[PDB]
Design a protein around this nucleic acid. Structure first.
Ligand SMILES: Nc1ncnc2c1ncn2[C@@H]1O[C@H](COP(=O)(O)OP(=O)(O)OP(=O)(O)O)[C@@H](O)[C@H]1O
Ligand SMILES: [Mg+2]
Ligand SMILES: [Mg+2]
Ligand SMILES: [Mg+2]
Ligand SMILES: [Mg+2]
Ligand SMILES: [Mg+2]
Ligand SMILES: [Mg+2]
Ligand SMILES: [Mg+2]
Ligand SMILES: [Mg+2]
Ligand SMILES: [Mg+2]
Ligand SMILES: [Mg+2]
Ligand SMILES: [Mg+2]
Ligand SMILES: [Mg+2]
Ligand SMILES: [Mg+2]
Lengths: 66, 114, 79, 77, 177
RNA sequence: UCCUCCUAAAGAGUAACGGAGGAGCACGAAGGUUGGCUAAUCCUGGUCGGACAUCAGGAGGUUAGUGCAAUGGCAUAAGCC
RNA sequence: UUACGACCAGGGCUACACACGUGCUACAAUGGCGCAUACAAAGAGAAGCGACCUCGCGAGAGCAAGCGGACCUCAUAAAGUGCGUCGUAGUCCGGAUUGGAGUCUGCAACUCGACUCCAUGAAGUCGGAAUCGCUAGUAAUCGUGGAUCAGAAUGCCACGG
């Protein structure tokens, strides 16, 4: 470090909206009560929900009731 | 003020700032706020942080900004590869809902050319 | 789009569809009825659909089961 | 020759109830005015009467004592 | 920081037992996170770099080093010495401290996130990454912004080949697809 | 008139209305020292961004650079800060 | 006049680098969106008009009396007024364009119907040269009705505020 040519380094409390209490040091100068984190990871639910495009027969079957 | 994609618009009534989401119009906004129980007149900049939580929980039961575009873009891509009449107009940039082509249809084409 | 009950299709077609499963793969089906839809037990069958003057051929895939034969045969030409 | 740009918002500056006064004398006392698109305005007056500081309020160089100022939306000053 | 204390004994043993290492140093270590954006279009305005430089300075707590044009190129209409981009190189605790916040509170705010690409490697076990928008960080106000500035983040590791470069990041819960 | 290369015949010099280019300047730093540093070019990866911009690591080792021609030099740099 | 006639099915009159005519919706605050609340004329209806009720977010689906009609149905008129929100933004203006679901008429809706729900949200911020209509219940603005018609009006023909 070169003696105050870098901005402030404030220890902020990363207080996620659904628990997941954290603690960091960032150049915000202000706290944050933020949304989802890496523990609240919507990486898997949306990963498996990729199976929504495909197939046309299956929609036909319900539409067929005559 | 953070929702599924982003809530840039504060300073506005809740039934309108919510319409910035790609997937919520003037109608879904009423259903979300009625589901939460937040009075429609509230201004987001004055909404309590315990109620923004309830706001976020709703849009998780409806297809919203992110996956909607992949849902749409694939459907158009599905038809384009199909070679149907609906597909073949998309690949050329022409109206698909049985509109005119003699004089109108500037939205699909663009500015004129001599 | 048609109506909730009873999607509407043709007679001489479906009778000629239920034989092409009886007799398997054969010559392309010269057909004219663009106003009939497609069905799951049609896949692998080439239908020579009328565009207005002649019989353009196809090779039906799965996704063309909720559709009608007509849009798979452009009526006019361009450029 | 000048470099024209895209049209600004129909309201460039709006300030009402704005009243800024230097220690001794008042420079602007309860102003209420609007500046619209394509309006050409000339500030004139005596020496040291606040012409240069009035522009500073518009661009937010120094803060008004009261009344609030709202700036245009697609400005290229 | 709050990730280094984890690596020094856990990730070591998650790889020593995996890749058949008899030494605490045949296992790779991640040594620096270079970080930069090339503003490029600062030809119109210097404020497009004066304000942009404060964006890396607002993410990394380090004043950026402005980069310059190495060789004149006629097509891009630049010559030697233009300031066309800022650059930050992080090492040590500030390397680990930023590494913590990126993979925890910055990745999950990417719009349209479907995992992290895994084939972006350079034959020696280094990772490169883009974000396409800088508002994904909790240090951007959405009101100080005027453009859509992106970034290039290149994790530089000491791994000898790519196939173990994944292991180093995977042991940190890296959302590889 | 002045500078560089060939003719010029391995010391110097050497002609033609022989074959090719340049100069009539610039610089209070572009000079003196003390520190530190090392390019071209291609390949691979990466937001816009591309044949060519910034970035990372690989091959390569001066094919780069020198205030302005050509020749001789230059890493101990004579190049860059 | 064994085809310049007759029958059938599919396609076309709905095309599209462009140019012109006639109109509709607008670029907002004399306004948009909400809530309750007003004051008319004219006309159509029997393989027709369709109550009341029930269900459907909605188009509407079931049952279903009445009317050949100053009797019953289409028939809730809208601008207006009272209160509330919006505070000049490509916006709570604009409603084009595309993606899903549906309702109906009709043997059949892809080429080619209308309407409804959800979503999406494009040009457009008063229009160059130039040109059009109109003298009193007129111009401007607001809705209603009818013929053609199984379905299909931004047109036509009428009616009132
Ligand atoms: N930095 C300052 N500190 C204190 N007083 C100041 C400052 N700048 C201006 N003033 C005072 O504010 C008043 C207005 O000054 P300003 O610069 O706005 O003048 P002006 O109206 O533009 O006049 P002129 O045409 O003479 O320049 C004067 O009384 C001046 O002395
Ligand atoms: Mg010699
Ligand atoms: Mg000799
Ligand atoms: Mg020198
Ligand atoms: Mg030295
Ligand atoms: Mg020197
Ligand atoms: Mg016609
Ligand atoms: Mg039509
Ligand atoms: Mg609207
Ligand atoms: Mg809509
Ligand atoms: Mg535009
Ligand atoms: Mg406007
Ligand atoms: Mg009709
Ligand atoms: Mg009628």
């Amino acid at each position: 470090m070169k003696k105050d040519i870098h901005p402030k380094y404030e220890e902020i409390t990363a207080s996620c909206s659904c628990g997941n209490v954290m603690k960091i040091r960032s150049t915000v100068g202000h706290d944050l009560n933020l949304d989802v984190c890496s523990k609240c990871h919507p990486f898997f639910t949306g990963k498996q929900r990729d199976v929504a495009t495909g197939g046309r027969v299956d929609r036909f079957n319900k539409r067929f009731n005559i | 003020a953070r929702i599924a994609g982003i809530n840039i618009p504060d300073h506005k009534h809740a039934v309108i700032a919510l319409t910035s989401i790609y997937g919520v119009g003037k109608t879904r906004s009423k259903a979300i706020l009625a589901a939460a129980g937040i009075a429609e007149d509230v201004k987001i900049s004055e909404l309590s942080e315990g109620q923004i939580d309830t706001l976020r929980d709703e849009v998780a039961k409806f297809v919203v900004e992110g996956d909607l575009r992949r849902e749409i873009s694939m459907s158009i891509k599905r038809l384009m590869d199909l070679g149907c009449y609906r597909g073949l107009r998309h690949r050329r940039g022409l109206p698909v809902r049985g509109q005119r082509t003699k004089t109108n249809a500037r939205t699909r084409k663009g500015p004129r050319k001599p | 789009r048609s109506l909730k009950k009873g999607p509407f299709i043709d007679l001489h077609l479906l009778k000629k569809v239920e034989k092409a499963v009886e007799s398997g793969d054969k010559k392309p089906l010269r057909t004219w009825s663009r106003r009939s839809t497609i069905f799951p037990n049609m896949i692998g069958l080439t239908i020579a659909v009328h565009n207005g003057r002649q019989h353009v051929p196809v090779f039906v895939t799965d996704e063309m089961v909720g559709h009608k034969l007509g849009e798979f045969a452009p009526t006019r030409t361009y450029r | 020759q000048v470099e024209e740009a895209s049209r600004s918002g129909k309201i460039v500056f709006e300030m009402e109830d704005v009243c800024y006064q230097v220690n001794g004398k008042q420079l602007v006392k309860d102003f209420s005015a609007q500046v619209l698109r394509g309006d050409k305005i000339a500030l004139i007056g005596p020496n040291g009467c606040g012409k240069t500081t009035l522009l500073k309020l518009m661009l937010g160089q120094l803060q008004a004592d009261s009344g609030r100022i709202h700036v245009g939306t697609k400005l290229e000053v | 920081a709050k990730l280094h204390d984890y690596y020094k004994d856990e990730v070591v043993k998650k790889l020593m037992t995996e890749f058949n290492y008899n030494s605490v140093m045949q296992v790779p270590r991640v040594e620096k996170i270079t970080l930069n954006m090339g503003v490029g279009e600062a030809i119109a305005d210097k404020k497009l770099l004066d304000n942009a430089a404060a964006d890396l300075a607002a993410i990394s707590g380090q004043k950026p080093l402005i980069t310059k044009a190495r060789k004149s190129v006629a097509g891009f209409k630049i010559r030697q010495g233009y300031p066309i981009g800022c650059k930050v190189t992080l090492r040590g605790e500030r390397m680990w401290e930023f590494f913590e916040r990126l993979i925890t509170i910055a990745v999950p705010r990417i719009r349209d996130f479907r995992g992290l690409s895994a084939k972006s490697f350079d034959g020696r076990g280094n990772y490169s990454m883009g974000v396409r928008e800088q508002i994904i960080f909790p240090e951007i106000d959405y009101d100080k912004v005027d453009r859509v500035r992106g970034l290039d983040i290149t994790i530089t590791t000491t791994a000898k080949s790519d196939e173990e470069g994944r292991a180093l990041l995977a042991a940190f819960d890296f959302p590889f697809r």
